[PDB]
Amino acid sequence: KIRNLPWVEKYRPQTLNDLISHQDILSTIQKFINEDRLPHLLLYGPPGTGKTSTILACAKQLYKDKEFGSMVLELNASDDRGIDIIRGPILSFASTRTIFKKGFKLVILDEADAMTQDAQNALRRVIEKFTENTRFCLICNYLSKIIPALQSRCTRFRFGPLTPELMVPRLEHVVEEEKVDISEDGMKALVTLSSGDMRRALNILQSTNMAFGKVTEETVYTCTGHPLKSDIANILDWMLNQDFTTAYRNITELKTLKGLALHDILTEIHLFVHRVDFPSSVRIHLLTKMADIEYRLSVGTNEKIQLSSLIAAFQVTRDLIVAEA
Amino acid sequence: AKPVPWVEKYRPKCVDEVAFQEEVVAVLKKSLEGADLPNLLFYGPPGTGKTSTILAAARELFGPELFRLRVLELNASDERGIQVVREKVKNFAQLTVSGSRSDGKPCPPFKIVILDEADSMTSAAQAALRRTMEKESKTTRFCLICNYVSRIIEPLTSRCSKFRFKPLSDKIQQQRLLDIAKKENVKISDEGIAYLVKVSEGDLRKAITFLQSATRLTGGKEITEKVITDIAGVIPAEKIDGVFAACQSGSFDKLEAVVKDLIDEGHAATQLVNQLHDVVVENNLSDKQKSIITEKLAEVDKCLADGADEHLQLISLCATVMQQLSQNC
Amino acid sequence: HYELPWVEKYRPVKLNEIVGNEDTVSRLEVFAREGNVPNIIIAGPPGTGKTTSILCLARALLGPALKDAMLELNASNDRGIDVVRNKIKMFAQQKVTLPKGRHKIIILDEADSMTDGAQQALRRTMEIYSKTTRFALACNASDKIIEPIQSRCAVLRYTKLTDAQILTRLMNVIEKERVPYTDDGLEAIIFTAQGDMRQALNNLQSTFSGFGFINSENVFKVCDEPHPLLVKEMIQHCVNANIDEAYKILAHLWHLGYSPEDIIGNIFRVCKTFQMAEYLKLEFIKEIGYTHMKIAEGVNSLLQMAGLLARLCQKTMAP
Amino acid sequence: SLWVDKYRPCSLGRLDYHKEQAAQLRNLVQCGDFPHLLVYGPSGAGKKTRIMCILRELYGVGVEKLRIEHQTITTPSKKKIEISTIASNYHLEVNPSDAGNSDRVVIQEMLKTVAQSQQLETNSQRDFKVVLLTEVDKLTKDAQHALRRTMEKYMSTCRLILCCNSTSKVIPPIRSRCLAVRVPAPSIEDICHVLSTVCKKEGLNLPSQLAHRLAEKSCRNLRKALLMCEACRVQQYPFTADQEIPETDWEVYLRETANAIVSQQTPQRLLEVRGRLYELLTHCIPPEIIMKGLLSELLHNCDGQLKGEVAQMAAYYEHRLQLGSKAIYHLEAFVAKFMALYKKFMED
Amino acid sequence: MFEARLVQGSILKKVLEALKDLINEACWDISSSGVNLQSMDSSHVSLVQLTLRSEGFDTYRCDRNLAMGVNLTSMSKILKCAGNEDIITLRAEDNADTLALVFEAPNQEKVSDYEMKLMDLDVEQLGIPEQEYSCVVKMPSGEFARICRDLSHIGDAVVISCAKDGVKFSASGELGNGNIKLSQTSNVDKEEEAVTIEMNEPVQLTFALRYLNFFTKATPLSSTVTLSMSADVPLVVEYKIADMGHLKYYLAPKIEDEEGS
Amino acid sequence: MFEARLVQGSILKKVLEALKDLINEACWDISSSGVNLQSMDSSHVSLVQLTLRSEGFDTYRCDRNLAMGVNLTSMSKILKCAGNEDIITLRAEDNADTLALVFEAPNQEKVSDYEMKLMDLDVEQLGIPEQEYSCVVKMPSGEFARICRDLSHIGDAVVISCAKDGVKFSASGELGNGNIKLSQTSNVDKEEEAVTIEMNEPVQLTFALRYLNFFTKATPLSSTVTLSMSADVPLVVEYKIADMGHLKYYLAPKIEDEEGS
DNA sequence: GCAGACACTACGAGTACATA
DNA sequence: TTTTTTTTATGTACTCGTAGTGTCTGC
Ligand SMILES: Nc1ncnc2c1ncn2[C@@H]1O[C@H](COP(=O)(O)OP(=O)(O)OP(O)(O)=S)[C@@H](O)[C@H]1O
Ligand SMILES: Nc1ncnc2c1ncn2[C@@H]1O[C@H](COP(=O)(O)OP(=O)(O)OP(O)(O)=S)[C@@H](O)[C@H]1O
Ligand SMILES: Nc1ncnc2c1ncn2[C@@H]1O[C@H](COP(=O)(O)OP(=O)(O)OP(O)(O)=S)[C@@H](O)[C@H]1O
Ligand SMILES: Nc1ncnc2c1ncn2[C@@H]1O[C@H](COP(=O)(O)OP(=O)(O)O)[C@@H](O)[C@H]1O
Ligand SMILES: [Mg+2]
Ligand SMILES: [Mg+2]
Ligand SMILES: [Mg+2]
């Protein structure tokens, strides 16, 4: 049947084989499940890489639908996870048996970086004393916000960013399930603008399919509003090759016609700077000035003056690069 | 029969009345047709129409009788703590989707949670929205409205489909202002509407406010360019020429005199920074002088954004441009 | 029955099975053999064997009377101000018949979580009933335990386990489990352990379950290299104003998925104990804090970290 | 009553200066659909007088019947914070900066209960109420972010007139939602005309030289000019042209502080200047005005090639003072930087 | 259209008072047989099975089957202002979100229509094994409420044992031990106060006192309680209402470990 | 000089806490007919009239029309020090700025005297129009306090509808709508429960919950309460208290939504 | 049958701190 | 060889004092 769902939730890897990237980690967790030797897991990485979906597929593989409510205790940041919850419901779930069928239980603590340090210190002996009865899975995006005791007690798997070569078949599966007309440059634009994020890949795909009806490079870069790489090359050429007035006029006309934002222009110019064989002092000056301009855009500032400063940071270094020779 | 200001009289009551935001309007019209609406993130400059677009979309999706049952609006004028997200948002997200439109129009099978001004929401309260958005996506949708997307955490950025609201172009803004002036039976010259769409800088709310205030000040006759220039707080060009003459003189006493005259005349320092930048990028100065003057202008604009004193920032900017103008002399 | 993981399955049950800190563990063996153990506080890094040493000492001292003469309190318990007054003091007053040289042991594991008032109420019950009861404390941050409690106990400090000390226990686990291995795979396990026996056992069990063999490629396919081991040379390149190699290390850490907060935390951790000039270190730390305020404010991109690296390179060239 | 309060104009037709702006403000509020107002300008220009004249144009004479209303507002920390509001039967005057950093609670709770209820009488009163928010530049950005949706949801039954000195401290979401009304300071001729009409209404004779000196010394502040003119008539009833004008104590204390700065450049003199700045800060003088007075006095003793660097240092340390929370650190940092620069200039 | 009419208002008060600090939210499953409720607690340790028969209600009609998950803290506030001698009507439509509660005042003069917003939780059905038990004990509910309250003063976990002789309650605490052994109290004038042993095999298990004390707040529902115990299946506290249905309370045993010595 | 003497200590101990969180000051106006009090809330919503006639006092002396203002922050804490069934008197000199009240200490042995400073506030009498209301109804006192408490758990604003059948209290919230309909309670033994309707014109107005909860804190003073509603006149909550006078409340209605077709 | 006393839990209030 | 005090905005955790209230004792 059809459901009114976002494509990040309509297409979720309910089984472990539907995930794409981390094949060694998923194979090791599958061999943990098959041997019934599942340890305390610590899944960390950037968002959108498949940490929640992995443990949900593992929980559905370990437990049946008639025993899932008494075997899995899933708590996240939307629930209260204070120290009275660690001493209360979590300890009573860990220290007791099951109801229907005998087996080890699972405590899923999603977004474990948001927990307080008192709760994390109270979690240590609950994990250690009841290893035979229950298992604890900790999910976080920041490993520095989890205490080193819980990092020692749980074996850590890094769910790194998804490579664009592996995000193509899952996007093709979503495309062929949703009847989406997409070209090759549309797929390249999706996997370039995602930057190791499967969630925003499906979000950009759904928004581009609804906005235009076809997914090409121009439709993706128009719906997202991201500048094209030819536009960034033209901006760099104007900033490095002519005077202040003509570069200001050309960059202002390009930003007015294309409807560009200075944040993405700064990001792509920062990526272009390290590719250009600059002198070291010129590179340091450009990085400091671009970081200052990027910091200035986080408040109620005028974007035209910051665009002029972005032009100025290269108009200063024109003479230094040329006189370096 | 009470009068209403034109920003609320000409608020978009439907998606088709929203101007220039073509991609999100097409997405919302597809959601009106019955397509799968994802979680939305609206960001951009003020006055571009982020709130009016989602309010028009919600009132077209649910209608008058189901707007109170399917739409929850939470903004910075009400308390949004961690407990408000844990209790008020989560219990609303877990409610059933029921109730049908009595006019025969189709109704989508979800609710809409509108979190306007998500910049002011704390990082702890934003972390509690993550599994609420993921688990309850079968029965509710979330629209986050903000101005700076860096003030929303990366999980909520990844969970929402981002739509950036561009500043309105001169053609679309001029067309909308001429339509509003046509419906209000007032007349405005072409130079007046050109200076209005130049002054408003893509802010359509500012343009509508200036048009209504110029109509009230004018009384009903022709709206010229002088009333627009006086009503916008635009500094005259003779003051800018006097500032640059005091900088070319190389004396700090005349610099203090023109800075005190501009401060005592009540001119805003942001308008002075904009006009000084417009003169600086369009003259016959060298590239290095223009470069460090524009960088000082950016620093002064950043300091004015953080609520520094206008007099000290303006005299520092004037000292810098005076040093640049008297260095080559 | 469900088999325990190798961290808990191969927990030592005698004090002679505990590797590392040979003098302190040997003195604990002597005190378990003879008796009359004083109050002790064992401090050190996680996974060193403090709780294992305390529990093995309590098992060797008490034996069959472990159920009635031992009180084990964790951070998962309450242990507030009213537990020290009404449960610890009542257990210290409790009459338990024990052999000569043996006292009741009140084990207060992870004493960092205990509040200041509870530790103030813990002093006189430590001092009065010491003829019949004893205290065994374990902690990580020993400064959180107050000075009067540390004066009332023999403060033991555990250091990080070396490569050979972890390697001996790993060889024992391998010979108990018949794990095929190579030398460089065990060196990779030691390198990923970083002085932690828990992480060594977890990485060994993960590599054995996922691949069935211990070489360097099977260890590094599931485990990871430690973070500050490359941040150290990134800071070294920032000292010599080498912005290109520092950005290469920064981009390599960025493409592995590390958040900017973790990267700048490792940068501050390296710069706190780096070997350079003191004034240069102070201005480096001030620049790190200035960038960390921007990261916590909301702006956190690769351009901000590159600007931080460029500012750290400038601070060298601006004496 | 003093001369600042006895001869204040009541309606827009009795204003001595900015008469074209007075006619424009009369034409603005006649129909009743006028938007939110942002009355801004220098202190003493006449912003509050024109706001009260706008309220006189909207409602009747009953807006002058003011009374003190005491409100108790509960923080999220459950600490009772007391604020005072001046209210009439037609409008309310709120200064949320009196609550300090808890002004966001005042905006979220006190203003929303005012806006959510319509007026009792709709015949003597009009269809909408006016809320006067005074010194909105001193509001934090959280309170201004809390302000913006109330300004759009209830703008048919509740209007807002915001008063401030600088619009740079007002966030662009608030500035986009309201019409900005600029009230400049009166000129020397305008202040001389006002003082001459006040002295003629008092039966006195005011010379043009004394009136010009009172206008020049007041720095185009008509309130301070009227106070100085009344002080000059209590001090000496024959208005001489070269009659001395009394001075404020904190201004001459700031001048002597800057003279102590330029007299000696030592850490001991820096400690003495820190004590003087502590004495200035304890008397509830704002630190930006301390920076402005220091820069106004230090640049008189500097050479022509040194003033720009001192002005840039003063702006930089005032920006760091606005970013920070302890003003004495940034004030002493600016004084120490000026002492180092002055010693380097004098020794070379 | 679902329309259930409570003949008495005291039973709905006494059911909800027992589940107030235990059941997170009420899952009313409605069919032609009656009203069912199988919901776990917040800690996923206890399970509550409630079955109200159709013949117990004053009037009961049900066209199509419904599953109306609703909040219980919201249901607690509307049941405090409910009389103990009046009829309460439960109403809900086919495709609506409002659960209507219509009753009378304690002053008995005004209607009181209390609507509740239904929740949309997707809860999987828990499979009750319905197997035999190695111990079945009939017991008064007043005595079972007293004994679990009396042993909460000594410890926090009770080692409740049963055999051919009778049920035995033990609680090892900080002060010491409290051992209660009651057997064969059927030789009294009343019929509710009786201890009857049905099954054979002895079983010793340890349970938390917090959940057992929550189970004893259903004491005014039934004058006699039934305890079921076995070595594998959990402990069942079966209340049987006289003319309305039955209530079952499940509680998992705690993990206990023998000393190595 | 002003001197008055009460007949019971509970006629001031039960009315002052109703004004404790409602109004910030208690302005007593002294006249030959009696003592008047008309104070308005700081939010310009609530308005309380309290007049006690001179015949109900034990004794009463009034030669000049004097008005005194005192704050609720200091008179509340000395009210709990005073007794319940003791006698209370109030004394005020003509020229002094001190209000002295003499009563009995709760040990019933010694004279306890407290002094309060007179706050000089320049207020004016608003003046009730005393117009004929569109609704007049009679409700019990103790039952009406239980009405507004029940709608306090639902929403922050209640809706009052008074047609010819009775008075309907409604509150639509995030939990669900709570509707009651008090009507036709004339067949009771006690005369204070006689619910009756004295007018014909219906009206529907919404009011704030918080001040109506403050209005129900003066309920044990009288046996009944009288409610008066109109189209634009504020709601009147009238208490006929004992024998010495009557108490009157006023509450401004809330805003109405733009529900035009 | 109704007034006084006993401990019971829920709730209001004050305070500290949050890193390596 | 030298010691007083309240500001930062939330969120959590701890600790202590207080007040309706269910239940028991008694004439
Ligand atoms: N490896 C993957 N393979 C396939 N789809 C994926 C993968 N990772 C993410 N997705 C998609 O993205 C959605 C969200 O994935 P999540 O598991 O929630 O990511 P996540 O790692 O949990 O990120 P955070 O840290 O929780 S915000 C899923 O429902 C899928 O549609
Ligand atoms: N795109 C638009 N089309 C039509 N009218 C618009 C548009 N944008 C703004 N307006 C008008 O200006 C008013 C302000 O629109 P908003 O939706 O509040 O803008 P905004 O994006 O919410 O600004 P911020 O960021 O909240 S301060 C609307 O009520 C309209 O009257
Ligand atoms: N010195 C050691 N010798 C042998 N095994 C050890 C040693 N240290 C740790 N282990 C193993 O690691 C497990 C955990 O050791 P613990 O003593 O519980 O850690 P810990 O020293 O208490 O550190 P924290 O601060 O409590 S995380 C033990 O069960 C052993 O399997
Ligand atoms: N048009 C005018 N004619 C005479 N006096 C004026 C006029 N406008 C302002 N003033 C005087 O100048 C002073 C300015 O103070 P105020 O009106 O509060 O403005 P601001 O709020 O800018 O200080 C007032 O005391 C008032 O008496
Ligand atoms: Mg997740
Ligand atoms: Mg908005
Ligand atoms: Mg330990």
Author numbering:
A (entry chain C): 16 to 340
B (entry chain D): 35 to 363
C (entry chain B): 33 to 351
D (entry chain E): 2 to 349
E (entry chain G), F (entry chain H): 1 to 261
Question: What's the publication's text?
Answer:
CTF18-RFC, an alternative clamp loader, localizes to replication forks during the S phase and forms a complex with DNA polymerase ε (Polε). CTF18-RFC has recently emerged as a specific clamp loader for leading strand DNA synthesis. Proliferating cell nuclear antigen (PCNA) is the eukaryotic sliding clamp that functions as a hub protein and plays critical roles in many essential processes, including DNA replication, cell cycle control, nucleotide excision repair, break-induced replication, mismatch repair, and chromatin assembly. In this cryo-EM study, we reconstituted the human CTF18-RFC–DNA–PCNA complex in vitro and captured seven intermediate states in the PCNA loading cycle by CTF18-RFC, including an apo state of CTF18-RFC before it encounters a clamp, two states of CTF18-RFC bound to PCNA, and four states of CTF18-RFC and PCNA interacting with the 3′-ss/dsDNA junction.
